[PDB]
Amino acid sequence: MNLQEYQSKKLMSDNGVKVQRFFVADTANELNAKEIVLKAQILAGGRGLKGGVHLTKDPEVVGQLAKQMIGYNLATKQTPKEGVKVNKVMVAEALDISRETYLAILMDRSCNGPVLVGSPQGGVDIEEVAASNPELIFKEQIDIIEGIKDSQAQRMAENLGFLGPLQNQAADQIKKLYNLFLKIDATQVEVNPFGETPEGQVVCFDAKINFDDNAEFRQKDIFAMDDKSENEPIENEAAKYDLKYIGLDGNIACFVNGAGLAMATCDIIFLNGGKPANFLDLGGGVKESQVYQAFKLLTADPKVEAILVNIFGGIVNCAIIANGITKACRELELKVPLVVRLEGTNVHEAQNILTNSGLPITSAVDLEDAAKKAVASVT
Amino acid sequence: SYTASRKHLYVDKNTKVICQGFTGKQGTFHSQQALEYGTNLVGGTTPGKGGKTHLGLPVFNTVKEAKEQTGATASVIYVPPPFAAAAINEAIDAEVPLVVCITEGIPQQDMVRVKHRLLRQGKTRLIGPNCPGVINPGECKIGIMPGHIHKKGRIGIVSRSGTLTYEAVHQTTQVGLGQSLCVGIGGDPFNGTDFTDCLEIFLNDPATEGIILIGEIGGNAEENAAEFLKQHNSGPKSKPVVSFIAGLTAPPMGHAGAIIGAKEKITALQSAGVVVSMSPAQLGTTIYKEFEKRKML
Ligand SMILES: Nc1nc2c(ncn2[C@@H]2O[C@H](COP(=O)(O)OP(=O)(O)O)[C@@H](O)[C@H]2O)c(=O)[nH]1
Ligand SMILES: [Mg+2]
Closest CA relative to residue A217, chosen from B297, B176, B83, B281: B83
Interchain contact, A143 vs B116, CB within 8 Å: yes
Closest CA relative to residue A366, chosen from B154, B179, B169: B169
d(CA A187, CA A209): 8
Closest CA relative to residue B279, chosen from A263, A13, A298: A263
Query: Which segments within chain A are labelled E, that is strand?
Result: 22-25, 36-41, 53-56, 73-74, 84-85, 88-93, 102-108, 113-119, 138-141, 186-191, 194-196, 202-204, 208-211, 244-247, 252-256, 278-281, 306-312, 338-343, 362-363
Cβ atoms of B255 and B227 closer than 8 Å: no
Pick from A6, A22, A37, A204 the residue to mutate for probing ligand 1's pocket: most ligand atoms within 8 Å of its CB.
Answer: A37
Cβ of residue B86 closer than 8 Å to a chain A Cβ = no
d(CA B88, CA B126): 8
* Contact map slice: B 31-60 vs A, CB within 8 A: 33
Burial class (CB in 10 A: 0-12, 13-18, 19+), A240: exposed
Residue B252 CB partners (closer than 8 Å, separation 6+): none
> How many helices and strands, by DSSP H and E, does chain B display?
10, 14
Residue A209 Cα to ligand 1 midpoint, Å, equals 17
Q: What pairing do the DSSP bridges indicate for beta strands B98-101 and B125-127? A: parallel
> Which one-letter DSSP state was computed for residue A145?
T
The answer to whether the annotation marks A108 as part of a ligand binding site is no
Q: What pairing do the DSSP bridges indicate for beta strands A208-211 and A186-191? A: antiparallel
Alpha-carbon separation of residue A127 from A5, A134, A147, B96 (angstroms) = 20, 10, 28, 45
Through-space distance between the first and last CA atoms of chain B, rounded to whole angstroms: 38
Per-domain residue ranges for chain B?
8-130, 131-292
d(CA B137, CA B3): 24
Q: Please, which experimental method was used?
A: X-ray
Strand partners, B136: B140
Residue A26 Cα to ligand 1 midpoint, Å, equals 21
**If DSSP codes are grouped into helix, strand and coil, which group holds residue A174?**
helix
Ion ligand 2 residues within 5 Å by Cβ: A 192, 206
Interchain contact, A109 vs B108, CB within 8 Å: no
Closest CA relative to residue B138, chosen from B44, B40, B205: B40
Amino acid letter for position B66: A
d(CA B149, CA B162): 15
d(CA B296, CA B277): 20
Residue A53 Cα to ligand 1 midpoint, Å, equals 7
Nearest Cβ partner for A109 among B163, B190, B216: B190
Nearest CA to ligand 1 atom 11: A124
Amino acid letter for position B91: A
Cα-only R_g, chain B: 19
Through-space distance between the first and last CA atoms of chain A, rounded to whole angstroms: 39
Strand partners, A138: A118
Active site residues of A: 102, 190
Give, in degrees to the nearest 5, the angle at Cα A261 between B288 and A228.
160
Residues of B within 8 A of A185 (CB-CB) are: 107-109
Q: Resolution in angstroms for this experimental structure?
A: 2.5
Burial class (CB in 10 A: 0-12, 13-18, 19+), B14: exposed
Residues of A within 8 A of B163 (CB-CB) are: 256-258, 260-261, 312-313
Return the CATH fold of A233-377: Rossmann fold (3.40.50)
Nearest Cβ partner for A312 among B163, B187, B259: B163
Residue A38, Cβ neighbours under 10 Å: how many? 22
The answer to whether the annotation marks B10 as part of a ligand binding site is no
Q: How far is B101 from chain A (nearest CA, A)?
A: 14
Nearest CA to ligand 1 atom 10: A53
Q: How far is A32 from chain B (nearest CA, A)?
A: 31
Q: What pairing do the DSSP bridges indicate for beta strands B140-143 and B133-136? A: antiparallel
Chain breaks in chain B (C to N over 2.5 A) after: 252, 260
Q: What pairing do the DSSP bridges indicate for beta strands A36-41 and A88-93? A: antiparallel
Residue A29 Cα to ligand 2 midpoint, Å, equals 26
> Is ligand 1 within 6 A of the CB of residue A97?
yes
Sheet holding A208-211, edge to edge: A138-141, A113-119, A102-108, A186-191, A208-211
d(CA B244, CA B262): 10
Cβ atoms of A341 and A318 closer than 8 Å: no
Nearest CA to ligand 1 atom 1: A96
Interchain contact, A266 vs B249, CB within 8 Å: yes
d(CA A87, CA A228): 12
d(CA A261, CA A276): 14
Cβ of residue B212 closer than 8 Å to a chain A Cβ = no
d(CA A361, CA A340): 7
